[PDB]
RNA sequence: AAUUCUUGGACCGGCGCAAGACGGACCAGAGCGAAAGCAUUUGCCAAGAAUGUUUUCAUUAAUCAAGAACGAAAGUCGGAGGUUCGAAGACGAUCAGAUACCGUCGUAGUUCCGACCAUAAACGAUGCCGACCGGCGAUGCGGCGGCGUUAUUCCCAUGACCCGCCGGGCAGCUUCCGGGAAACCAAAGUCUUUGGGUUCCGGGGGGAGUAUGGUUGCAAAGCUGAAACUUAAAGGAAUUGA
């Protein structure tokens, strides 16, 4: 390839590229509305949390910090927030 | 590449284009300012306040929710600690290495790594002296460096 | 570290041209680069270009034609007097017919032809031929 | 040992690895236990222990990584002891034990937000316990002798939910939560329980002050549902006046009047109104509506009962009262159902209701 | 073969005892470290790269005379120790001769603690920081996504495989990128189309890393370092012969 459309890359190619090496850099992370099996109130949690996010009143604990993405505990539905 | 290492690590944050605060966030400038005040007065560095906010409360960046940087909020309110929270951490490490090295005398590696950390303390201390964050008399001296926590 | 930004911009154009690419990506854009590339374009060595605008130093995608031989920088930026344009463009440029020395004058950034025209010295940035 | 200048500052260095990966999860309750069996001085082993224990039981619940799996009987009994001791040392200590100025120390920690949302970190312990106890019951073979060995703790639970209820330093307004809890245990206690606290007729038999202590329980639904309903016409949420009334309706069935509980079921008008709540409300509605038809039959109202018990038996998917029924269409959602499923001894028998449609007709 | 050992029972075999060295096979064109270098278990102490990040500070950075830390082996002084091996030396052979190769002994040393010395083919014989310019298959660490296999049998979920993607690292294969005197090198490329930043350093071969002065070390010696005089080649890669 000599001719490549540098201005208009297709989404798959720049979804693949390292987050800094894209044309306009953008994070691979997100925020997610996540709820407990018992309670009704929802909590906003970061994709790569890196803290332990306690359910308000320490009713339980939602996430656990790891290398990359924060592991959400078993029996907690989540809906990733978008803008 | 790293200041005192042969590594060429590419691993840091990537801010999005849109600086606009998203719709789901209901925390206003004064609500997060009350939150930042509470966290700092509990005893917590501008770094640890920032992660607490984005992890638990869902505050993308405080510079967009508020109009200020966390330290400019805290130093305006007068809750900013005197000697900065990177100079602090370099001194704290340097004391921790020297305390180890005073016991384990034949630790030639700890001796070399202590020299590297102290070269980094001097180099950041003089930046803060020029920018008038420290007095011109401020000294890093291992004799009474433990007096600084 | 990146001490000269125009130096790397022109080297990356030069390698892209030699390799036979149709267009190239310049990373840290600046007024001096955009003002260099408009002088190139005005004679017609590069086509159009589009400066991609993030909230940082921008990026430039330049439409290369195959009518550029060499585009090189001169660091350091020497103080070229008007009576020295000849002895600079004698040993930098290939011939007296084609090739240009862009130099930053008080008027703006322009080639040796217009610097002679307006009766002005300045500082050499680079050359393209 | 030192005036909570080392105790509140270790409590935090042991309650920091809570939910971190390499914590082991198991050798943590030990370190939280070696702060009441090593703490043995006044407000230093005796008084501030409210807080050390709040973090001892919260971590004991967190011996289970999953929230869709049941606790084990050893740590379960340990909880039922651990919860009791807090209640007994809290009763004879008329003070708010996460703040609210009393003397000077070791309470009055108003430095942290406000002693309500962690002062009401007592019922969210015993409420989490009540939601835990259902997992023990759902995850046992119902025809086994282990099931009845496990139901022997149904009595142990209802004594603690009574003890936390007697704790009326509320601020009905917001104790409504443990009124819903209390009635959710008693609303289906049968005639032998209901009748045989007065049906030994009141003479020199059972109307003395020391025997009339369990006859409080049948006329308790009326005592408590009245509050939990007529305050939540003002208060916000839906669940703690709709679970409460359906408990009142279901309890006023299976022993008392058809006419009494039809007015309540018509008053609510859920016949056509309950459409857009959650299935864990729409299940106990079905249980109530089935108990309507059974009571009408048992009374001898043998066509208004038939005109009611049609569409349940007409459809083969009548298993909205029991465990999950038929095979496929979404494994992904069939997994969600087997923690919605109602407990065994609560289930009304199904060759009992098949023999109520096909006898009313 | 001999010098050595052995009927005051050597060598071989069994059961124990002590000593001081050393960590085989697993062990790899694998890993870590600024280089020297680093391998049985477990515990304690401080350090570190890479990755992840919608955390924080806001130019704080790159390279560096002066100055400073570490620096294999050998070697010197002091204390402890001395299993193996072994400069010196004692012989036994071979040889024209052997002051060597070979063989039996063997002091210093080899090992540990504390002071020195500061050099190696200390090598990638290749300064560091930054950007750009082909392809392929693997590999070590971190992350991310996906049929399926196997263990936790209850498999949520982790571990062992499988298929791909991203970033740092040790390397490999391949080509008319291009360069080069070539051997060859994706860097030793982007160099008469000569300019990104900066430190050290070379000028035909000898004389000579010698003399002398200075400085460091207890000593050995280290760092800095000429001249007279002699000489037309010395040398590098590759080719064809012998």
From Swiss-Prot, chain A:
SUPFAM superfamilies associated with the record: Zn-binding ribosomal proteins
Span list, region Disordered: 1-22
Cofactor note text: Binds 1 zinc ion per subunit.
Claim: Nucleotide-binding is one of the keywords in the record: no
InterPro entries according to UniProt: Ribosomal_eS27, Ribosomal_eS27_Zn-bd_dom_sf, Ribosomal_zn-bd
Gene from which the chain derives: RPS27
Family named by the database record: Belongs to the eukaryotic ribosomal protein eS27 family.
Compartments, as annotated in UniProt: Cytoplasm; Nucleus, Nucleolus
UniProt name for this protein: Small ribosomal subunit protein eS27
Sites where the protein binds Zn(2+): 36, 39, 55, 58
Entry function: Component of the small ribosomal subunit. The ribosome is a large ribonucleoprotein complex responsible for the synthesis of proteins in the cell. Required for proper rRNA processing and maturation of 18S rRNAs. Part of the small subunit (SSU) processome, first precursor of the small eukaryotic ribosomal subunit.
Cofactor requirements of the protein: Zn(2+)
Highest rank taxon of the organism: Eukaryota
Cellular-component GO terms for this entry: cytosolic ribosome; cytosolic small ribosomal subunit; nucleolus; postsynaptic density; small-subunit processome
UniProtKB/Swiss-Prot annotation, chain B:
PTM sites of type N6-acetyllysine: 26
Residues found modified as N6-succinyllysine: 26, 33
GO molecular function: small ribosomal subunit rRNA binding; structural constituent of ribosome
Location in the cell: Cytoplasm; Nucleus, Nucleolus
NCBIfam families: PRK08561.1 (NF006331)
Keyword presence, Cell cycle: no
ATP-binding is among the record's keywords: no
PROSITE patterns: RIBOSOMAL_S15 (PS00362)
Residues modified to Phosphoserine: 29
Descriptive protein name: Small ribosomal subunit protein uS15
Positions carrying Phosphotyrosine: 37
Family, as annotated: Belongs to the universal ribosomal protein uS15 family.
Post-translational modification: Ubiquitinated at Lys-26 by RNF14 and RNF25 in response to ribosome collisions (ribosome stalling).
Keywords: Acetylation, Cytoplasm, Isopeptide bond, Nucleus, Phosphoprotein, Ribonucleoprotein, Ribosomal protein, Ubl conjugation
Species annotation: Oryctolagus cuniculus
Crosslinked residue numbers (Glycyl lysine isopeptide (Lys-Gly) (interchain with G-Cter in ubiquitin)): 26
From Swiss-Prot, chain C:
A GO biological process held by the record: translation
PANTHER family for the chain: 40S RIBOSOMAL PROTEIN S15A (PTHR11758)
Keyword terms of this UniProt record: Cytoplasm, Nucleus, Ribonucleoprotein, Ribosomal protein
Assembly and binders: Component of the 40S ribosomal subunit. Part of the small subunit (SSU) processome, composed of more than 70 proteins and the RNA chaperone small nucleolar RNA (snoRNA) U3.
Protein name per its UniProtKB record: Small ribosomal subunit protein uS8
The protein's role, per its UniProt record: Component of the small ribosomal subunit. Part of the small subunit (SSU) processome, first precursor of the small eukaryotic ribosomal subunit. During the assembly of the SSU processome in the nucleolus, many ribosome biogenesis factors, an RNA chaperone and ribosomal proteins associate with the nascent pre-rRNA and work in concert to generate RNA folding, modifications, rearrangements and cleavage as well as targeted degradation of pre-ribosomal RNA by the RNA exosome. Required for proper erythropoiesis.
Protein localization: Cytoplasm; Nucleus, Nucleolus
N6-succinyllysine carried by residues: 87
Pfam families: Ribosomal_S8
Cross-referenced HAMAP family: Ribosomal_uS8_A
GO CC list: cytosolic ribosome; nucleolus; ribonucleoprotein complex
Aminoacyl-tRNA synthetase as UniProt keyword: no
Lineage, broadest ranks: Eukaryota, Metazoa, Chordata, Craniata, Vertebrata
GO molecular function: structural constituent of ribosome
Family membership: Belongs to the universal ribosomal protein uS8 family.
InterPro entries to which the protein is assigned, alphabetical: Ribosomal_uS8, Ribosomal_uS8_CS, Ribosomal_uS8_sf
């Amino acid at each position: 390839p000599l001719a490549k459309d540098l201005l208009h890359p297709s989404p798959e190619e720049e979804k693949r590229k390292h987050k800094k090496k894209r044309l306009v850099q953008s994070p691979n992370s997100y925020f997610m509305d996540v709820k407990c099996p018992g309670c009704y109130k929802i909590t906003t949690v970061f994709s790569h949390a890196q803290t332990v996010v306690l359910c308000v009143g320490c009713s339980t604990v939602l996430c656990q910090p790891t290398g990359g993405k924060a592991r959400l505990t078993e029996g907690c539905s989540f809906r990733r927030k978008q803008h | 590449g790293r200041m005192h290492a042969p590594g060429k690590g590419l691993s840091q944050s990537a801010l999005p284009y849109r600086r606009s605060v998203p719709t789901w966030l209901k925390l206003t400038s004064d609500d997060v300012k009350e939150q930042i005040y509470k966290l700092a007065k509990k005893g917590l560095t501008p770094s640890q306040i920032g992660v607490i906010l984005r992890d638990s409360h869902g505050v993308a960046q405080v510079r967009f929710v508020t109009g200020n940087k966390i330290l400019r909020i805290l130093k305006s309110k007068g809750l900013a600690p005197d000697l900065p929270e990177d100079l602090y951490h370099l001194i704290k490490k340097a004391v921790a290495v020297r305390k180890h090295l005073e016991r384990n005398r034949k630790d030639k590696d700890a001796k070399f790594r202590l020299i590297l950390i102290e070269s980094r303390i001097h180099r950041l201390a003089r930046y803060y002296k020029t920018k008038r964050v420290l007095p011109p008399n401020w000294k890093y001296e291992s004799s009474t460096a433990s007096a600084l926590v | 570290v990146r001490m000269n930004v125009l130096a790397d911009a022109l080297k990356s154009i030069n390698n892209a041209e030699k390799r036979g690419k149709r267009q190239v990506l310049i990373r840290p854009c600046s007024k001096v680069i955009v003002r260099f590339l408009t002088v190139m374009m005005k004679h017609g060595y590069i086509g159009e270009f589009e400066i991609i605008d993030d909230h940082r130093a921008g990026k430039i995608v330049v439409n290369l034609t195959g009518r550029l031989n060499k585009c090189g920088v001169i660091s350091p930026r020497f103080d070229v007097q008007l009576k020295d344009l000849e002895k600079w463009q004698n040993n930098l440029l290939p011939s007296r017919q084609f090739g240009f020395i862009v130099l930053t004058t008080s008027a703006g950034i322009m080639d040796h032809e217009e610097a002679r025209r307006k009766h002005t010295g300045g500082k050499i940035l680079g050359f393209f031929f | 040992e030192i005036t909570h200048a080392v105790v509140i500052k270790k409590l935090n260095e042991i309650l920091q690895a809570r939910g971190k990966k390499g914590t082991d999860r198991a050798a943590q309750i030990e370190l939280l236990q070696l702060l009441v069996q090593i703490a043995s001085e006044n407000n230093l082993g005796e008084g501030v222990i409210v807080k050390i224990k709040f973090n001892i039981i919260a971590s004991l619940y967190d011996y289970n990584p999953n929230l869709a799996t049941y606790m084990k009987p050893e740590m379960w009994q340990k909880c039922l002891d651990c919860i009791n001791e807090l209640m007994d040392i809290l009763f004879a200590n008329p003070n708010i034990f996460v703040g609210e100025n009393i003397l000077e120390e070791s309470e009055n920690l108003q430095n942290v937000d406000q002693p309500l949302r962690v002062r009401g970190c007592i019922l969210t312990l015993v409420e989490r316990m009540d939601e835990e106890f259902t997992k023990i019951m759902q995850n046992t073979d119902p025809h086994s002798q282990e099931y009845v060995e496990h139901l022997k703790d149904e009595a142990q639970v209802c004594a603690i939910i009574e003890r936390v209820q007697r704790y009326l330093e509320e601020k009905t307004e917001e104790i409504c939560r443990v009124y819903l809890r209390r009635i959710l245990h008693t609303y289906y206690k049968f005639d032998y329980k209901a009748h045989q606290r007065q049906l030994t007729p009141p003479e020199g038999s059972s109307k003395s002050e020391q025997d009339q202590a369990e006859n409080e329980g049948e006329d308790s639904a009326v005592l408590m549902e009245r509050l939990c309903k007529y305050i939540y016409a003002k208060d916000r949420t839906d669940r703690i006046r709709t679970c409460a009334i359906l408990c009142h309706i279901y309890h006023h069935a299976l022993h008392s009047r058809w006419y009494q509980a039809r007015d309540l079921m018509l008053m609510s008008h859920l016949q056509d109104n309950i459409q857009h709540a959650d299935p864990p409300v729409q299940i106990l509605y079905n249980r109530t509506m089935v108990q309507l038809g059974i009571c009408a039959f048992r009374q001898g109202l043998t066509k208004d009962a038939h005109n009611a018990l049609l569409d349940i038996q007409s459809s083969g998917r009548a298993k909205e009262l029991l465990g999950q029924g038929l095979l496929l269409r979404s494994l992904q959602e069939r997994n969600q159902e087997q923690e919605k499923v109602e407990r065994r001894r609560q289930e009304p028998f199904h060759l009992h209701i098949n023999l109520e449609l096909l006898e009313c007709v």
